[PDB]
Amino acid sequence: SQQVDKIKASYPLFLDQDYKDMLAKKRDGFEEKYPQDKIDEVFQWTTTKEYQELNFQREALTVNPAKACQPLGAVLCALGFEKTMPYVHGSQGCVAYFRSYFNRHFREPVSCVSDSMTEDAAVFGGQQNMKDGLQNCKATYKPDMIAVSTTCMAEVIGDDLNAFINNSKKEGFIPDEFPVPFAHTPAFVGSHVTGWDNMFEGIARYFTLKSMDDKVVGSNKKINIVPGFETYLGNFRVIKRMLSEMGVGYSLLSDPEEVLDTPADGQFRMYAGGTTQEEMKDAPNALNTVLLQPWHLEKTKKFVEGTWKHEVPKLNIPMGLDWTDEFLMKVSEISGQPIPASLTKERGRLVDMMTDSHTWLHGKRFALWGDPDFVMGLVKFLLELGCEPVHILCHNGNKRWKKAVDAILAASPYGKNATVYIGKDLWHLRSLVFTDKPDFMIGNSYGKFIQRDTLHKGKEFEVPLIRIGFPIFDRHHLHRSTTLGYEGAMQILTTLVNSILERLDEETRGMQATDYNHDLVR
Amino acid sequence: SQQVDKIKASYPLFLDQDYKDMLAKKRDGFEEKYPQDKIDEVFQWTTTKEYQELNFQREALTVNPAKACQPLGAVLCALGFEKTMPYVHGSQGCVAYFRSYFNRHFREPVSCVSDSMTEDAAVFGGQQNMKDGLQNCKATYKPDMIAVSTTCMAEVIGDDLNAFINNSKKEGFIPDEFPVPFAHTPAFVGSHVTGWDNMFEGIARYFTLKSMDDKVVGSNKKINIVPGFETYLGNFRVIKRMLSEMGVGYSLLSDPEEVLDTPADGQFRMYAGGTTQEEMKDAPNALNTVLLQPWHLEKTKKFVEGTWKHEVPKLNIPMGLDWTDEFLMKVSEISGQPIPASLTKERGRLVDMMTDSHTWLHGKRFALWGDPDFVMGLVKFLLELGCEPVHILCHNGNKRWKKAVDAILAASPYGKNATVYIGKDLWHLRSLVFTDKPDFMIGNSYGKFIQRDTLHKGKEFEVPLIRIGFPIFDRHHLHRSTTLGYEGAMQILTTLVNSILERLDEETRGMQATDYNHDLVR
Amino acid sequence: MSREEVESLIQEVLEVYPEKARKDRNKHLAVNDPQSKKCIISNKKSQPGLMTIRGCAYAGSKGVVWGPIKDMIHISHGPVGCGQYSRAGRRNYYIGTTGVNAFVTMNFTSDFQEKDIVFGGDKKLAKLIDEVETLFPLNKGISVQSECPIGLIGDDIESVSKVKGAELSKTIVPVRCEGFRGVSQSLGHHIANDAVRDWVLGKRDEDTTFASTPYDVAIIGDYNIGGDAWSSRILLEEMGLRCVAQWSGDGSISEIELTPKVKLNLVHCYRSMNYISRHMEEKYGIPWMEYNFFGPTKTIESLRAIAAKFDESIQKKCEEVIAKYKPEWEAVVAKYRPRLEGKRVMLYIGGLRPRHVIGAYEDLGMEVVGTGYEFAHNDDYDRTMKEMGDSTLLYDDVTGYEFEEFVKRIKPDLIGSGIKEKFIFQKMGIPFREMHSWDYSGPYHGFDGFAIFARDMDMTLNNPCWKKLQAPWEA
Amino acid sequence: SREEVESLIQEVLEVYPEKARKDRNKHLAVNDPSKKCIISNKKSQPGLMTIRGCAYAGSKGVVWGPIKDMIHISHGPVGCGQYSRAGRRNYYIGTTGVNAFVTMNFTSDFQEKDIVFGGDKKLAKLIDEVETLFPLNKGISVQSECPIGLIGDDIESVSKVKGAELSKTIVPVRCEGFRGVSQSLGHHIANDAVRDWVLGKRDEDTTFASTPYDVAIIGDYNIGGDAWSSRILLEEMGLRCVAQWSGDGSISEIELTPKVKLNLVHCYRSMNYISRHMEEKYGIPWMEYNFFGPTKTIESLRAIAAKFDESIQKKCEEVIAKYKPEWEAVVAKYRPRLEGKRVMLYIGGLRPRHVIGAYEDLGMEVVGTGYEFAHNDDYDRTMKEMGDSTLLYDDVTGYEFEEFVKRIKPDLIGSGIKEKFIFQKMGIPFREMHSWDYSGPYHGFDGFAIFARDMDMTLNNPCWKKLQAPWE
């Protein structure tokens, strides 16, 4: 039944007695469901140390991973270039998923095409798909550039991207001067961030490799900035804002902030802003190149150093106080520009917030996960706040990265109870937050199912989730936030302290039971 | 008992069994407490319509007001001027409360002195206090200016501020040329926003009245901006940022954003930034004067129109989409500068967010309270979002303001269930959220005791609080947010939508009970 | 508007294509004359590089058919991508304890690495099954959903399924739904249907222990999006019928095994489940009928048609249900129809809803001036021409360029489509409702769902945001 | 120290005009471990940014506010009651709005009509409305704000008349903010109001079942639960705490106090007045104790037990032996982290000396302390606690406190909210010693663990090393 004056959606419609009795009859009559006491027994078992030890013995099964496949990052990299169409050579199902995944995180259109390789192509390659696909794409959507990656089926069969594209130009399907950079992005190697590195190195190769004779380091007096896989709009804007405040000439290579934030003014803009082909052609003339996320920009670093002859400085991701400081001092040394008073004052205002909030942050235990560069920056900032990052999980991390993070933890008393996990998924983390309960989780939307599970054991065992990372699907507009620089540190700080205070207010809201501590002033 | 490994603060230490038995013995033994069944009986009575009728018949009793007294606003106004020491002629207890109140909201030092009038001053006046106070303040804290207001003591005894100050210079306690603007700020008239208007009109009086002969309207090609009582740092910065983007020369009269946000860099800065005396002197030479909060700048408006001869435009506070547009178009008309593409794009990005979130905002019912200008702008924006502002409370609003808000409500279908209340306090609102339950409250920290009351009736009756306004004491650094312009609308929108989504997640978190609707994607 | 105007609209849009693409797309764009094959073809390969909306066979098998089965564990066999982008993306609701006895919103995968590509993953799959049994003892079956590389490298998941299934006395279903197969999600439905037939549906061919009644039915092809199936089940059981099984929203493995015991199969989604419906009629003799629970007019029509398959007692209870909910949906129309009367709609969804929801819009005075399918067949278009008005635009496997150009010229009041289209038209200032996920609302089936549907169209179509697209100074 | 502190005092006073110079000189002294070296309880010099509050704060906010089952009317304009709503963490147990009202703000909200015609007619109406909307209140107090005395209202007659009409305890308090020089006179006025209107309600009553171990906690306002962490120790020692003045206190507990055998005074400054009265009228002796830190707590338990018989003195040593391993573990953990660190304090009337022992229990040294509104007898008790060559200040000004800190450079400062953010920006760890920085409790053994944890987390926090940018 429905009352027209107060219509009920699925929740709480199906809580009505007639629906509740109906679901009970379906269960008892035909579902052949395990009895409830057996379900509770098994659930309680999955929260124990015994289950965790079996859980960590896995080596063939992955449950709730915290990573995606390469071509997803290759798409995000391509979208950062002006009038550029991402183009995934292979099966069209992947592109439907790529667009939907980004659609839901940014809540914006995401343009990407496929050449729709099918069963027949599995036997004789997708050369014809490339010829017709490139010509159809250029004619229909009028891009200035097409950046080609690959799905896993095209990688298994062994399609030669270089040859197929050259034949498309040779046979007259697209003009020979039309830029078509390419990169092999195998889903069964690395993760989405590896796909970002591969796509970017491919685009850099395309525009510089053969034209290195007339280049000389530093002639354009700019600094190249390579962001890497970055899903926060504010992180692109804060980097450009700080360098502009310093008067530093810079070149952001792959800049999707405009195309992922077009205005709703009556017209759909498929393309917007982005790095120009001219900026890529001229990049070798920069003073140097800074890699914002070096732990998944390995391939790009080798090319920038090997071919452009730039001496990429050893810099951590500019997150937190120390690493933002070092980033600015290195930019100052390279450009010859002093750090302006405005950034000095902004730094002091972040420190002021740290002093004002340090009593609520001290000792708070956190589990967290994400991509390698983002995680260690988050770990670094937590230690600076006096927090304990007890559970550090990076599904797509490697041994060399874990060694670095372990050194960061050892250099602080707040890293004493911390452990770094690589190759583990969110079902591994579920066990960790049960057997070694932290105070909060910091992670993407998939963590909400770990919070649900902890609450089922008990209110005193619930581990609330703080959404910082990718993807974020169940809140709106957090993709506009910032995590880099002093600005990002202030936003993270504010989110952490107020999550602690919100949780405290809830636990002290019971009248005449716990509301003695329901303070007005905190 | 305490375990040194995990020390417990008041919560949950006092939930230990031994503390529990102790407090039970204290109650049953010596408190002579009413029976719990009677306490429950009376509580449920306070949630009824019959109690609400009794509650609204109050003539003399005020319970939990949503306003402060005048000199509080006079202090905030004076803080906005360069090297200006606020100075409250009266008793010192008021200044102790003024500083602590702002201390807890801004989490910053708040400088303000008093001349500490005692019992004998009540019989013979506070002239001697003024003489020694002005000389002592000037010498010890070395301000460039001293803005004088009054406490209710000095107003009752009828101390003539103009005479007392003139006698202080006449007797040589302070130099003749030392600026000492003044204003009478009776705590028993109006509220804290009236103190802001009085203090500002007094400062403009001191620097322009005796020198209008040499002024020419529009000669400096600037526009004066008077912000009024404003406790969000982001609101000062968004006005300056939008006018700088428009290329509009402007003068922000009273600008405390610097002194209320000094960096923590090893030294304390009593003064910082602020409106310069020269800017006040030259203000009559502006093209016009814009009042950002016209409903508590009544006195200032009459002075700027009658003395400066400025045709102050009829503009609402620039909150929401329509009133930010009107603000920018009027600024464009006055200055001759066109609205740039950057602000046009920002507007379109706010519209995009509104289209992205409208399905979750639609029909949501809100109770809200605060100051008149802030309240009507929040009502306007809620109507734009498709929400229903059911209970609109403004303790310090007047008859004319309520007619203006009723006209805004009538011009939209989403305000047909709305009611504007003036002269009512938060004990009135408590009844409204019980008898006509909304979905959320939007207000200051004092609303947390209403949420606690609603939860005690039951989880189904709980009305969550959304902290927007002044003062906010139980969250950190919300005073940095923005509520004006497109930027502020974007922040408010985000806070509202994610508050709705947080509450939905909590109600659907129960496993095998309501988690069928615990969607990953929303 | 007029028939010639829309035909000339088609011609102008195709002018941008190369010759080859132009000649193919012309066969997929037509104007309705109410013999579908006589004016439009479908179920063809997508032209390369035109930004199709379609997915793959894995999506049609894993995401659509098998995914919703709650007490089974479904393994995404291959690299990590497919299972992650499809995790909890579809709102096929269910009752259960996730991670203990239900697993719908979880992502199980073999996470293929390079060593698995060059030496196969059959040994890894056997290990994976053992690990599943250890950590999820209450699972009642396992399905292995093949991703693209599995078929290309020559793995034999059927051999692993049979060996491990006998070793553990477990139902293990191999599904060769690799994404390169077929042309869309459509073939994934068929592949999944054949997997159910060959590995599950016959498990109780010999058993007679289940007590049958003359009113046993089965809901086939309702995936309980936002509770759609629960809103449909309650009506059928108020009519006196006993719903034995739900395929596959909130469906359990036992419900599937009991389906050959019912007297009538009620098929909602023809496209995805007609294969198994025709099988059950040949092997078990169970007849099947299509029905439609979108809107009051269709719901009432379907209840009466279903009741006519039984005796007078069900027909009597049928009119009781119709009389009970009559004042409810009449109040909905009375309130919302004057707010939506005359508004024009364009639809682009998958394989059923582009026609099934027309009656619901018409129950609110709205007109569908254009509809289309991602992956429908000719038999779906046959059924569409009876539903759509005359001189309305039909498009098969529409391209991003075509859809935008059609909207620009037709200028509908509302667009109902998928997430990959939503934010495009919102920026153009056209109200948009997601017609796959219900924009995280619903249910829309049945009488209770119609109230939500009308509330949802109205809140979006008449929302105040749509008047503010243009800044006042740019006019 | 020594002559360095004396030259510091003089250098700082050189900024003042002559008149203020001569007055402030009397309120600054170097300890030689009170009259003889420092003056106190004098008016504040105008315009020097003192930290003191007013008599209203001392009566409404401090003494009367915490009484939970009474309703306290802020009589006057709207300001005072609003700035003091829920600002002080005098914790309590109850149902707020039904049978407890501490964190609520009741006010008469004076308008001009009330300033001209008086508020006596409005107060009588206000009381009738309180009775209908809050029927479970067990008393009403009227806290006067500045205008009440200046306009000529007679709240006392309003109290008597209404009190008799409704058979309710109505307590008029003339705590107008212009009275006195600080919060101190508010204490006295509030104590006298308790005497004149509440304390003698059960003088004829003999029904209370008394025991020889009955005591009252006088002068503990349960900041963060301080009084609860004190009561538990006393009752473990075998005593019965009949009353707590006034944290979590009820009006019936106050009426029962004249029935106890001993008054345990924690805050001498605020409650010595009523304590001296109960000794004269009812013959109840009173004694001062100190539950800050294990050293002071053990000594206090032993001195309290000595006032009773063998069994109480036996239970005392059992309590001491019970908590010994707990506070020894606290010292073993936190003293090495705080040893040798120097502290400066500035609080109200009790804590600037009462917490010294706790800091010393952690190996810390208080190099300077001072009060806002203490009297001569407070500095008498202070000079024995403080060490030689330590700085003492009375009613310190914002300028003096800033200049003293810049020269002494303590490792930790403990003061109020109006000082907190000044010194944090200077890079000096700060702990609120009024509100416990929203932590605590700090009394008793359970409170010492929290105190030690709080001092360590702040003093050794990593934020203090980042004040200076690596590029200056």
Ligand code: ICS
């Ligand atoms: S199964 Fe099909 S695309 Fe029939 S693959 Fe698709 S939950 Fe659509 S039009 Mo998403 S043939 Fe169902 C469908 Fe319809 S996923 Fe849902 S909405 S009624």
Ligand code: ICS
């Ligand atoms: S009552 Fe006094 S100022 Fe003795 S007015 Fe003040 S809760 Fe202080 S040093 Mo705030 S004489 Fe209590 C006090 Fe001490 S409010 Fe508290 S901390 S022990």
Ligand code: CLF
């Ligand atoms: S068409 Fe379909 S969704 Fe595409 S891969 Fe093939 S089955 Fe799967 Fe999977 S992992 Fe990533 S997203 Fe592709 S490239 Fe390999």
Ligand SMILES: [Fe+3]
């Ligand atoms: Fe968007």
Ligand SMILES: [Fe+3]
């Ligand atoms: Fe601060």
